[PDB]
Design a protein around this ligand. Structure first.
Ligand SMILES: [K+]
Ligand SMILES: [K+]
Ligand SMILES: [K+]
Lengths: 250, 250, 250, 250, 250, 250
């Protein structure tokens, strides 16, 4: 390997300069298998990497793991291997009543409720997406008729207390996070997820391009158990969007 | 007057929902002059307001004064009078070597070196521009052939120490700000100015749209003294851009 | 001009070393017209400057604009033109039940709810008035029989959320400021205004003298609509106080 | 699955109440192999879980992934499945000159350079290990003749800037972290790693027991490249220690 | 004197390397009088120092005064006189329902609600006890059959608001401390006291050993007025524990 | 005793409402000796209290101990016993070149480098002295011909690192404090001491009056070792001043 964690060499990327970065290994394969000549490059730790080809150009798909720390490793090491543009795709829960299940969210910037972002810039620096990445994601969403919302995402270092879940071992949320969700919702924040504050700050502060899209599988203000088919469909639409954005950015 | 500071009634705006918001009263007249049927509404404190018409729709031009506090009053009061979209235009000094005098900067989000932003959202919330305003401004800039840079601005509550100016009465900059400019340069920040962290945070957290464009009049990394014609022609150019963007947002 | 914003040259001040600094341009003229040989020097942006003469000595009167950012510009540039003492005068709303409309408040130090003060000293540094300025203001108040309170002022970068006003576009105050007014009132804070934390910190940390007086036109704990005559009278008394303090400091 | 991420049911754990929690899935199998009746339970995302038996009692081995966010999910979900005791084992780089390759570190508490710890306790709360776990780990280490150091670890949300690595894409470390390593060295901090501030804070504040041991594979103050056998033998040693400590805690 | 405050010379310690450090002067004599050859060395300010002999080795007993500032003086100056291990003993109020009056608490680490600790390490650094000191204290407690709890202590710079006492002059607790006790209790914190955050941080960060034991004289969740005999007895048991720990550490 | 720490009953104070509060018990007797009918009340911990009579009115003299925590107890308990006015007197080291040995400093407000102030007001609140106490102290100083400086003091929770002393056990000062002295010097801060940020913040936020004077015994910018007579004569002078100020406040 040329890098400490990912198990990749430079020539494995075959000159690729853009990576799609979902959180989980299983989603990596789903994305790669929508492109041409997909091949699995490595699986080490939370980092599963495939390569594929979009209109004859190599693209990398690499899982970050959950959370800013592992995201920050994957981004640094892909950047040492020549990636310059990073597009995150996820599935997510909306926290606004007007957002419906199956809609698509493109994130302009994130609330920094993480710690890794601070290791690249002080908290005053905005966790903001690159404008060409956000443009390409919005255009790609439009290209398939998706209902798209464009706006702020809250990016949390935890899945449970940081997102005000109370059905937990302790049933407790620390005072600084208790009632925080209501604050984000009053400020128009669309959803929570767990990697973007890190991803967007570290790229924006390091002259790398990054952007994020997600499909909505649950709305916590009108909460239903998701249907398996609907989740598969929404995941696939967000996967097409991020791939089509990739095509516009190359 | 329907509001505490600006000296305006609801009727004065004639149903306008968009305002262009420069910092100084003198630029208000320059902008309103590009549009049809320009009329002066009011001048109180740093707040000078004109109305004009663009493609048959009324549009407001109102000066903010320097800094987040006066900006916060102008935006709140114009929101109570029905403004939903706010476009800031300025002239500015670049802090990157690759940006030239006469180029145009469109701000995707700002470093919050201000205090009024904190009165609307905690510091972890991004001072992020509206995507439709940012798109309208970049497209407008490209439409008249501007050389355009799109990215992060540092937004300071001072002109002098917070922008690391040392030719001052004391010649001193407080420890937290000394060497901060080199940090923002390393992080790819384009420029400093003094109203956008407040304007962008307050609009983003209250469901108002905002965006900002500026024309470059000096580069601090290769600093030349500008002549009056350079400054006038750069101001004209940014003013043309912001009016063209207002046209696409109406 | 010798300075970037104010439009003043050194010799325009005719050797003046003290400036009275109200927030608004209209009040500048009212103060200057109580002294001898008043002349308007400049009006640019929020900065309206007059000169006058008190017992044969030149005094400057210069509006700061609203907020610490513009205050910080006016102070720095007047200091480069030789001013060493700065007295702010305002009209204000009291937040304590025992303070009556028409009473006079002299501020010993301010709660720093601003951002510009941080560009001169870290938050632990007190936004404290010069003792000879505060002495002269208290003595001047006594010299006209005013009812005087001497104590702390809360200095906010916003007029609306920072002062817990809820009759606003959004009707919302961010969590960190919601219930803050009750905290200041329990701590004996007399009133809010919007320039003193900046003014007092930047002078105290730069070896310039500063102090502040204000007349009370409303009490928010027993809130009445002010009468026009009472406001004019209270404004004039505070204007006499600051001028008489000026006379004692020269 | 009874839980959102790990892919486990309550029955799968067979009444286990103790888990050894390494960072990577590959080490899970190495640890489970030392114990009796090792069986694989589940592998989802960075979470690989085996069960085995120690002195006739079932014990869990589950990988956390890198960083506090994924660690926080694994601990919460294993707590909902009845785990009350969590023992982290790793390999690590020392930052003190007196620590040698092959020595073992047991962590009494950690410097919180992470973000997920903040989602359980404010920063003033100590990221402190359980005394019984720490005792079991030191006694286990001394039991096989390890050279043992017991003390403070720095726990970072990044591998690169937060541990002051400069051979990176940017070669830059943000101001707050530049020179931080020399501060932790002066303060007697033993090492860096990336999960313990979260693991220890969340357990200490929720009535769960946790502790951590690690084997030293590199010393950054006298840095040698390790061979594969050094790394395997150091890992074996720490793995033997953590299983021996689990035996004393059952 | 060889030091600024304590009034001690180096040779007065007769080679002692360990100090027992209670808060009050009266307790100093009680401890020294349980050892051999006790002699009073000095009483200056809050700093009363005795020497005595444990199994033929000199030990110092030195009051810190109340609070981190005076603790930090006594620790620095005893360290300049050769002390390397510092054991604090106190009497305390428990804040957990399961802790009984007459039980003994050994502190693993402290919540840092003080200011002096910040003058040795940033807030992220844990106020953690030395593991050999905490071991010796737990073993010493066991050696006399005491009921022992081992865990976190909240260390406050105030006795009244910081510990949420409301029967005070003002009856007020500042917002940041109002409802804090309930947070510590939900996080398992055992008790409050006023010197350990300073003591533990400054020693842990300076390569000195420190630990703390206390006997419980009141439980604030089931609050009774303490009986004089019970307080004397519990004090004596904690004094024996700290002396017996001293013996194990020499 | 009516209070937890000081060993005083309400009757002991004989209706006194003013206290002079030096740091050390030994200075209590020196101050009480200047007044009429001096009597010792109590000595517990660092708290030594005498009563005496000034112009026929009873006055209290009570030592605070070193640092905000013990100061906070003394002020709270003396407030419960009816003290409304507190005058601190000390001897101190100047940090400005223009201040001489034997000069007197009166403190208008303090830099909050302490922790107990935070238990009464958030850090943005000024640690400001009462105007009547400050006036009485300056007038008293001028009344006996002192050379008087009036201005800002830095108030530290430590004697050693927080005042940048390096001839210590470690010889190290933590990053946040290293170079802080030069910042306070640049900002015109007169001196360091260790009780006023707490004394002034707690009194200012609870409607109690406080002020502080000190005599200069060393100048750190031109540091001479003082002889015993210099120290005694400087102490006498400040003690005379504080008693004279108490006379004007009764
Ligand atoms: K992870
Ligand atoms: K302004
Ligand atoms: K003390």
């Amino acid at each position: 390997s040329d890098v400490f964690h990912l198990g990749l060499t430079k020539n494995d990327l075959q000159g690729a300069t853009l990576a799609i970065v979902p959180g989980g290994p299983d989603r990596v394969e789903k994305i790669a298998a929508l492109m041409d000549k997909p091949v699995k490059l490595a699986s080490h730790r939370e980092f599963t990497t495939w390569r594929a080809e979009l209109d004859g150009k190599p693209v990398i798909v690499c899982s970050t793991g959950i959370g800013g720390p592992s995201t920050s490793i994957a981004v640094e090491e892909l950047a040492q291997l020549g990636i310059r543009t990073f597009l995150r795709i996820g599935t997510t829960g909306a926290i606004q009543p007007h957002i419906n299940v199956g809609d698509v969210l493109v994130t302009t910037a994130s609330v920094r409720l993480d710690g890794a972002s601070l290791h690249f810039a002080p908290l005053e620096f905005p966790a903001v997406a690159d404008f060409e990445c956000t443009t390409a994601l919005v255009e790609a969403a439009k290209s398939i008729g998706a209902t798209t919302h464009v706006g702020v995402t809250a990016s949390s270092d935890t899945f449970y207390p940081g997102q005000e879940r109370y059905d937990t071992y302790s049933g407790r949320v620390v005072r600084h996070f208790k009632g925080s969700m209501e604050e984000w919702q009053a400020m128009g924040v669309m959803n929570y997820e767990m990697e973007s504050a890190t991803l967007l700050t570290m790229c924006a502060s390091q002259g790398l391009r990054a952007g994020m899209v997600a499909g909505v599988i649950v709305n916590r203000t009108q909460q239903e158990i998701p249907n398996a088919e609907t989740m598969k469909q929404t995941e696939s639409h967000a996967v097409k969007i991020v791939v089509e954005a990739a095509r516009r950015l190359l």
